[model samples]
Target chain A: MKTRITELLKIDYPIFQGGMAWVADGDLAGAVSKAGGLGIIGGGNAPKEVVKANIDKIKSLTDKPFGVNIMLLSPFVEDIVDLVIEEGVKVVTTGAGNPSKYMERFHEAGIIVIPVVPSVALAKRMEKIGADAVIAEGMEAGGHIGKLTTMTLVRQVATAISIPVIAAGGIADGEGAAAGFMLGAEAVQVGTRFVVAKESNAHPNYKEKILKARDIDTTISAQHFGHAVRAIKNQLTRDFELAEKDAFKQEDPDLEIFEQMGAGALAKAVVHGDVDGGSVMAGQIAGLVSKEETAEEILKDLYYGAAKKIQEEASRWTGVV
Target chain B: MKTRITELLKIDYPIFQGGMAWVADGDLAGAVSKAGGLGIIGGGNAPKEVVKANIDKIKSLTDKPFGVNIMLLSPFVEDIVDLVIEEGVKVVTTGAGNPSKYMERFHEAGIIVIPVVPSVALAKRMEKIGADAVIAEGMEAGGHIGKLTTMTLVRQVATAISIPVIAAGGIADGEGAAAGFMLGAEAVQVGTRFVVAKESNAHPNYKEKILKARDIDTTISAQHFGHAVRAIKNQLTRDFELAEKDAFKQDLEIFEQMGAGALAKAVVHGDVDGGSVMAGQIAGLVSKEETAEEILKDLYYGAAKKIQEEASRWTGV
Candidate 1:
């Protein structure tokens, strides 16, 4: 029953329900926490009021611990941090810019602060700067990414940093979770796999979009722009491709336009079905999220499945006794 | 004791001393056979008398089995095939063009034929058309290669075809050979390492060039052309770049023209100082070379080290 993440969060399994903007709320976070894992509320460009509402909503469901995701680069970062501090939130995950910048404030708030890392150097830097934990995102996971593949990247980061290392990106079910642990990950933070969960507030079209995907459908772009990004390939991606091809011809497209199209519009595509206008941010695991299940069911399935696989692998005697 | 290439050749370990056009003559070929590996002598646009001299030399060195590498696409293919027949060569390896057109003649002369292959589809087709075995050369190979990295191509070829697969490309020593076997190859063919051996005719500078190399130093060129080749990166390769930019021009029309005998002269004789050199990704792995016997002994040591390291990871679990 002792999970690595649980020891860190004082919970059962080292699992964390990833934060999504406007989608992850108290209901989902509370559900995850109630099921013996940590749940996190999305600090999606929150106005001061939405943050308060979500905190109260989560409180009504479970007095258990949870966290808020704060993108340090967002315009509302200061307001979100202030609100989180006032609410006495015990944990925080920050990304979308350097999290090292505001570490002192979160630490002063007496919270266990972790950052999303993409590389070994970044993970080491965070660990050096006092990050409570680090999530190493792979290309298969949704949202932003660096160039290295997860299988190579996870092991590299795990070997480099001594802190509690959580594997993110590309992880969907129990097998992936177990694989991450086998590779030295203490826990896993999954994204797109939970987007279609029964407790999630994702649009039906978003769930359908995930279900319709195949393994090869997703592609990465913006690597030439100095930032690697994985996104659901659609019309918006095609238009960016045209601009990129033109940019490569001249070797300089507007990075600002590309970044906005990726971060802002992508969120719109998942929730609003504005596929032509918006890009859907997803990981490689989007291809495997073919069915919907309740949050609790997913929690149980991941736990039991990962446990069974690790046990079976541990039993295999390939070497001399 | 079968060598890896002999296993690939279905004779022993599946080892083959790759036929360097100017280097792998009768003595080297016979030496490879005596060491329990297949050997090959390069036809090298040589005359019948030249071919006869190598055959006689090999006969004097060892009575072991060896082969002749004839450039089947060469205009002299007919004459060379006749010379190989007259020489009583037991096996033949052909490259640069399909050899099926002459496989029947060699078969009639009681010769076993193995062709160098670079793709799974090509391996299957070669076996179907009458090749007895294949040397699946990957991108890591020296001399010439088709597209596809050894890490990707070897498994595809070995799994898709039933013929014994002699893995080539990037294999410099026994550790490399063992890794190839773990990747499902029956044998490994090495080229650059042999180039540094005492029996090798390669210049000391050429051997030194490979000895000073590291894994990241190799480059693949003629990308726009049909044939892609991997070589050690040098100033010669830099000129290759300048030539490739104008590849559409008549002089550098394709990989063959850009990589002609003139470039070979530049590399071999150091004429161009920085002209293109034929090498492999494994060139960096080559530090020094002794005699062929010493090289083989070191191979067993390298294999032992690799196998022991893999075994240690399974401790007490």
Candidate 2:
């Protein structure tokens, strides 16, 4: 697992804690960093003061390296960018939109800029625009998603760009990690599995729902709205889909009802434990996750298990396990 | 690449030609088999005699091992199963529905039974019911799709079941194949890349569209209807989506209209410029119209190259 990602990010393992909205915060990010994998504070649509407080809290917990993911679509993206720089944050991961305008300032501040891209074109564009690396996330990821799958996008992005590629989405365990490396990714960003981490701020009911999920428990909705999201099945999604159908029953098609259905629902789920009416964002691999464990246990298992599996799989041709 | 899949199927490589509806036929399947990969005739809703004619045509083209895919949703599924058994087909790949009812008959006939599964639950069920293997297909695949991505489903299926797992969906080259193996898949099934193969019976327009696709050229529609399909963006899909938006205006839902008209156009006429060009996300990688043998050789070389690359990556630690 000691690839460009480890060296560049200054982490013991090449695994990353996905900066998931609501689920990832000061406690979760700090625990992941202390566990030897890079932790990330998700800068969702929160205001600058809230993000600043979270960053300060994480700094007080761990002296090791950590990252802050800035959702470009957030109303306070500029404030968050300035905050990271003013706070001397060394690494930043951008998501949801292009970061071309802020790349120079981020690079000048000695921050390693990694953007989460969904397609090969975006990866190459980011590379050309001087991003340090790109996280090629696929549609199986939680929250907002693109059209391609991780199996299809990672290798294409890795082959197309000179910079390192970090594979994200649909990854849960060591086999997934090994598969990422085989597909030419320098690292992996895992979300759903880590949402069950004991350090995660997700409510108990949220964690319980994740653990109880069957393989077919999740579905992707809002695809007709052009921004698909994967989440566990709940009454909220059922109502949303039903309302979307009813929206078509009117004189004209309306997406506001469909859009309003998910407003603040994710925060409700992760913070309030509102499983019935809240939007619980999760990946398809949520079915594979069964327990709430520490970040240390999860990271160690991922790193060592990947090493063992790689050695075992490598011996297939070499005959020297 | 010689694994359980290769041994069971008697193929030189652990690769299978996906049973694509109009694209896969006797010439394409036979050529793939001749090139050291397992070829399959797509028995897409065809009658018993039509499937028999395809099997006979493949036999005339190549003496190598081949298989037949049976879409379980087809009205002729029962007849197709009986025909395969009577025709002495060694392998049967099923799609769309449960095969629990026919497992005993397939097993008794000495046929290798592989079912295309989209979830770990389905894969485990198929294994419990005595499926010889399961093809873990993801939403990235062409035509009908499931929710999970190939990256997520393959490893879970491989871990859950004791039987061999073949990875499908989004596999267009050697790197994808190697990644599948690393995730514990014994073989790979490729579809869209093979659609443009020189031996494929697809229309020149269809091949041309695939060869010219960009990374974002594909769209997944019918998601609201619970049966999402991935295909290249075209006028038919555009019309379907627009009509879907207006479904409530008419007496009948637009889905029936969309399904009935588009299926025949794409499958029978291959109306490329107008019809839905059923293709996977991997269509972006299909850049050329090469012979089936050339495509097979390229896939094998790419898989081998990735294996060597992976070995080097592992030894670095």
Candidate 3:
């Protein structure tokens, strides 16, 4: 059964699992595609070898059509591009850097290339670049970030761009999906809530991190490393802030020292038992994360939640349709 | 002859020229002090040698008291602090970082300690630290900035703290000052308008920058950096923001690039492309560059303008 993103790839629901690095792999992607939504295997910062393995695994799991993410800033972007062409990946989602150059080549290959743009200005640029579609990410959704927040960012981008938009960030439930559709988003992309899905590849440490979150539990750190990364607050964040104060007082620039002392060190803490030092990235909607379920259960839950609301809302209006 | 800040300083007309780094040097500070206003000499990132030299120069220029600006994040803060203590400086204004630790020392020395705090939350902190006064900076003023605009910030801080509050940022005329006083501000600190003063040390490029900018020109950066700073638009700022970084992925060092270096290159060096920028949101109100005396006179004119306008209006009630 093709999903909406697939139909529009010509597949089923308009949903697309965000391509998260190291987490959303073949199993996760295949499970999602089988459950009637398009899933792009997370290839964020992953090398070509890693992506190929993930793709093979997805093929073995389900004979369904799925996509691969080409995260632009990954060191092996060219390799990921080559891998996508070789694997005959049906759709390609891009992020982290400009996707302007690849649209021509990918479109020529008959792969639907949808780019995620966060700003109204960027949405117009993506439309001009000939992207098949766009995902206007809001602040509430997990990962990367925008200042305009979801409501402000989504409505503005939807108004400015001509293509169909998939709203990502801050969406967790069926009511959220319904709202996204109403705001001109043909679909929605969800992340934090999916961690509890039965087939998740998220580290237990990562799962536990999401499990402990509140509705507004997260704070996006703007420049912890070279990029503005959001993560759970713990010792490493406090240390980074203190070091930031120290950096301004230096007669010399020591950016390398600051980053070296930041999340890179914290990643070690994550893999190890340095609970005080680990870096955990989660979104504001992590509070909604609860019992783990299958991809089918999660999608159905969202659809039914939205359908129930629509039925209730319809009764309030004097319509015959 | 006492100016407004000094009068609020409990000395004169409630007039005191703000200490702008690199520009408000000894000469400008001394001139204002001699003219009966509390002049603040810029110690913005000044080295020990430059600070001591400026202190001596101020003494040579005027016998009247003046203040020193010691930014807590400055690499040279310890040296400046030592210099101020040794030089018997009578007042100091702190900004961009907390000055809670420096408050006691200045107060113990019988010097009035004032920290520029923008929010009521911070005003309470300043009062707890024994600050004699606090400058409730509003977003309207320029430079490394405040979250609230002057009118709202002053009212909140005045209600929250026992200390006399001086309103800084966004006030360009006497009507604003009168309003500040009514809002519970003891005085208002004028920075950009002074740069265009006849006696100011501002470069031609810096003055022209203020003269040309409108209200929509300022933006706050470095919040991602930890310490939020504000500035007028320029190419460097535009270049830095070219690729929008995700707020969630931000680390501390990313923000350091946003501050002092960009300001120094632009304002002190006169690199107009984006490096040299003005700090006030109120730059929109400026139509032309005028002498300090002319600027002050316009404040009086603005006061008259506001008064006549108020008198002419009819209240339906």
Candidate 4:
């Protein structure tokens, strides 16, 4: 576990809980930080005061290091960045777009800035812009994703840049962590696995849905919209696909119908617990996670399981020619 | 290197040459087998006589273990299976469809059967049908692909089945092979890297294009047809995509127009002019063309060096 990510972030393990919208909050972030893994509060489209309150709540829960995720697409992104700096948050993970404009301020405040990139070109830019590290987020990841797979993206990004590359998407267990390392990643970022953590703020119905997820339960939609999102197969996705097919059936395919169908669906599922009609964002690796456990127990399994599997695979090298 | 695949196939290395259409032939397959890896003759839409002739040529060239890849969708598939049994072929790898119907017959002939699968469910079913092993291929791979990636599919399939798993897709060198092992694969199936091998029958233009390929040159098409194919970005693909878009402009999208003659147009003529280069993402790693022996050596170097380094990181355990 003594990798560049652990040392850089001053965490005991090289695992970082993904800043999943609505699912990751003060309670879950604090629990993960206390469990030796860096935890992050995802600041979706919430207002500045809401994020400030979350930071205050997390501060009350743990003295350990924690971070906030900045969604660059948020209408209140500038205000959220100002709030993050004023609140004295030491680390920030960014998504949705380039974080270059805010990097200087974060750097001026002595904050560790990690941008989640979907490609190698972006990772190179992140390194050049003086960012600390880049998370190589693959299409297997929940929520918004890029075109590359973790297998291809991690190795490419790690080789192309000098900075540490944290692998994400489709990772839920120790086996996936070890595979990420084998692919040249220094750390692994997990989202769907942490969604079921006991400390998570996910709705009970959302957690239940995750607990019962199968391999084929997740899929990607909105390719036409150019920002594909992965989620558990449900009425929302089924309806969206049906509507999209209908649009295609017409001479003029209207994308707004598909867009409107997904709008507010994630919040409805995450905040309102409408599992059937709303978007339940998850990854394919949900099948690997079976039960709700403490962040500490999950960390133990990830670290120890990865260590054991790595040892077993390495020993085979000596036996082979 | 010895692994389940090496042991099962009785080869010296845990590498299998992909049965690439029009590229893998008697000389190339023989070269791979002679170089200590498993070589396969791709039986792509060829008649039984042509396949038998190629098999005979391979046998004459090398006494090492080799395999025949049967495209299950080929019109002469039934006759080809009979020919394989009659020829005493040691191994058979299948694609395009289920091999359940031919498994008992192939087993009766003492042939080691392996199928290339895109999902864990398919791998489990293949094992249940008495397959000796399954190739967990990912979308990053060239040719026909499934939705899951090699990284995810290999581990899931390995965990789900008792049969040995051979990981295929974007792996081009030792680093990829080592990653496959870390993901629980017993061996690695390589195609794009071998396309540039000196012994391959690939057109010189084809070899040159692969040697010059970057990581992003490959693109996927035919997703609308439900059988997505990965190939190098070229005019053929561009034109096909344009035709597809135009079809969408019409009230009825005619899929047959988009599918007709595109593949042959590339394999037969595109190599010279960048029409359609069917290469995997790993083609970016192919910078040199050497003998099959040298290529095999490079693969071993890549895999073994990575294993040593990765193991050093895990000594804390």
TM-score of each: 0.57, 0.94, 0.52, 0.95
Q: Looking at the true structure's interface, with contacts defined as alpha carbon pairs within 8 Å between chains A and B, what fraction does model 3 recover?
A: 0.00
- Report lDDT (CA) for all predictions: 0.69, 0.85, 0.67, 0.83
Question: lDDT tens digits, residues A1-321, model 4?
Answer: 389888888898899998877888898898999888889999998899888888888899888888899999899999999998998897899998789898889999989999998776788899999989999987778899887778778877888889999999878778788878877889999999899899987888898888887666788887754568899899998998777667766866777876677778888888789999889999877766688999998888888888887787777776444
| Per-residue lDDT over A1-321 for candidate 2, one digit per residue giving the tens place of the 0 to 100 score | 368989998998899998888888999999999888989999999999999998998899998899999999999999999999999887899888789989999988999999999888888889989999999998888888887889888877887899999999988888888788878899999999999999898999999999998778887776545567889999998997777556656677776776677789999999999999999888888878887899999997777677777766556534311
What level of docking quality does candidate 1 show? incorrect
Which rank order by TM-score, best down to worst?
4, 2, 1, 3
- Candidates 1 onward: DockQ, in order: 0.06, 0.48, 0.02, 0.49
Local accuracy of candidate 3 as per-residue lDDT tens digits, A239-317:
7777765665566757786556554443353334354566665565565566678888888776665555444333321
Best by DockQ: 4
**Higher-lDDT candidate of 2 and 3:** 2
Clashes of each: 29, 0, 52, 2
Model 2's chain B TM-score?
Answer: 0.95
Q: Which candidate gets the maximum TM-score versus the true structure?
A: 4
The parts of candidate 1 lying over 4 Å away from their true place are A247-263, A318-321, B1-317
The C-alpha stretches of model 2 lying farther than 4 A from their native spots are A252-261, A318-321, B248-270
Report fnat in order of the candidates: 0.00, 0.57, 0.00, 0.33
Ranking under DockQ, best-scoring first?
4, 2, 1, 3
TM-score preference between candidates 3 and 4, better one? 4
User: Least accurate stretch of 10 residues (summed lDDT) in model 4 chain B?
Assistant: B248-257
Judged by lDDT relative to the true structure, which candidate is superior, 3 or 4?
A: 4
Worst 10-residue stretch by lDDT in candidate 4 chain A? A312-321
